[PDB]
């Protein structure tokens, strides 16, 4: 038993991370700017256990992974977290279940997931 | 602010706790499963407080049953203007589907289910 947060009211909270799904399709850069305007970043995958809700996410959504692969915050992609699969020539990646990243053209519009860490 | 309290591995949203269960069970077995977790099946009371339900994919048991109207496990009645009820099978139980639909279903049919706690 626990509390979850802190998060803004309109975000899903799970294991002290805040998540928000955006259905208006945008390219990777526009998606990044949208999350930033909400004091957040695109989804960062750092723990299969602490982010196991991602097993339930269907369809395909921008996350903050760019091409080695690294996150927006400049940190590296830890091994054993995502299976990166070629799909379209590009330097950005879409999250899909379960813990997959599909390589995609950064200019192609897609739905996206923003995330705020609380620590 | 903070959301909860909830059990550690449940989703929290606007102070309600939600858990999806992938093992298919009939309505009665699903009700017993949620009760074992000191919870109940999903109750829908507000499209605003529960707008995350717009994002739910597929069909899942909720706590709505027919006896002279539809009622939740807790005995309260279905509020008007909350769910569109759709009938394509003979039954006395209902599956939730987005967006704010209830599909009448045979209580004996195995389905995935959503538990909720508050
Ligand atoms: C992109 N989005 C939005 C998805 O993918 C959504 N996924 C499913 O709703 C979803 C898909 C499945 C599933 C397995 C195989 N096919 N499908 C559709 C099986 C179950 C669910 C599910 C059911 C109930 C709940 C609930 F009620 F406990 F919360 C949460 C998920 C989604 C992912 C993560 C969180 C949410 C939510 F609801 F919290 F906002 C929704």
Q: How many Cβ pairs closer than 8 A exist between chain A and B?
A: 50
Task: Say how many CA atoms lie within 13 Å of B85 toward its Cβ.
Answer: 20
Rounded-to-integer distance, Cα A93 and Cα A86, Å: 9
Other C-beta atoms closer than 10 Å to the C-beta of A21 total 17
Q: Choose among B76, B15, B23, B21: nearest CA to A7.
A: B15
CB contact under 8 A, B9 and A58: no
Which DSSP string do the residues of chain A spell out, in sequence order?
-EEE-S--TTSEEETTEEEEEEEEEE-HHHHHHHHHHTT-EE-----TTTTGGGGG--S-EEEEEE---EETTSPBPPTTS-EEE--SSSSEEEEETTTEEEEE-TTS-EEEEEEEE--
Other C-beta atoms closer than 10 Å to the C-beta of B2 total 15
Beta bridge partners of B84: B101
What phi and psi values does residue A32 have, to the nearest 5 degrees? -55, -45
Rounded-to-integer distance, Cα A58 and Cα B20, Å: 14
Question: Quick check: A36 contacting B, CB < 8 Å?
Answer: no
Do B43 and B72 form a contact (C-beta atoms < 8 A)?
yes
> Method used for this model?
X-ray
Long-range contacts formed by A72-78: CB under 8 A, 24+ apart: A72/A32, A72/A41, A72/A42, A72/A44, A73/A41, A73/A44, A75/A44, A78/A46
Give Cβ neighbours of residue A45 (< 8 Å, ≥ 6 apart).
A51, A54, A63, A65, A81, A82, A95, A99
Q: Please report residues of B whose CB lies closer than 8 A to that of A9.
A: 1, 14
CB contact under 8 A, B11 and A14: yes
CB contact under 8 A, A13 and B11: yes
Residue nearest (by alpha carbon) to ligand 1 atom 27: B18
Q: What is the span of the domain harbouring residue A13?
A: 1-119
Question: Quick check: A13 contacting B, CB < 8 Å?
Answer: yes
Q: With helix as H, strand as E and coil as C, how does chain B read?
A: CCEEEECCCCEEECCEEEEEEEEEECHHHHHHHHHHCCCEECCCCCCCCCHHHHHCCCCEEEEEEECCCEEECCCCECCCCCCEEEECCCCCEEEEECCCEEEEECCCCCEEEEEEEC
CB contact under 8 A, B3 and A1: no
Domain count, chain B: 1
Rounded-to-integer distance, Cα A89 and Cα A104, Å: 6
Rounded-to-integer distance, Cα B20 and Cα B6, Å: 14
Question: For this experimental structure, what is the resolution in angstroms?
Answer: 1.3
Rounded-to-integer distance, Cα B91 and Cα B66, Å: 8
Beta bridge partners of A93: A103
Do B20 and B37 form a contact (C-beta atoms < 8 A)?
no
Q: Please report residues of A whose CB lies closer than 8 A to that of B2.
A: 3-7
Contacts with A, B 59-118, CB within 8 Å = none
């Amino acid at each position: 038993e626990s509390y979850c947060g802190p998060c803004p009211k309109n975000w899903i909270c799970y294991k002290n991370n805040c998540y928000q799904f955006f259905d208006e399709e945008k390219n990777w850069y526009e998606s990044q700017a949208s999350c930033m305007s909400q004091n957040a970043s695109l989804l960062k995958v750092y723990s299969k256990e602490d982010q196991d809700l991602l097993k339930l996410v269907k369809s395909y959504h921008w996350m903050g992974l760019v091409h080695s692969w690294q996150w927006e915050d400049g940190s590296s992609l830890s091994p054993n977290l995502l299976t990166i699969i070629e799909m379209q020539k590009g330097d950005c990646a879409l999250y899909a279940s379960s813990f997959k990243g599909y390589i995609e053209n950064c200019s192609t519009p897609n739905t996206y997931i923003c995330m705020q860490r609380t620590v």
